[PDB]
């Protein structure tokens, strides 16, 4: 996710 680059 854009807000959570760790996941995607």
Q: What is the largest distance, in Å, between two alpha-carbon atoms of the chain?
A: 9
Coil, helix or strand at residue 4: coil
Residue 6 CB: number of other CB atoms within 10 A? 5
d(CA 4, CA 1): 5
d(CA 1, CA 8): 4
Asked if residue 2 lies in contact with residue 8, where contact means CB atoms within 8 angstroms, the answer is no
Coil, helix or strand at residue 6: coil
Query: Which pair of structure tokens corresponds to residue 6?
Result: 């760790």
């Amino acid at each position: 996710t854009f807000f959570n680059p760790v996941i995607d």
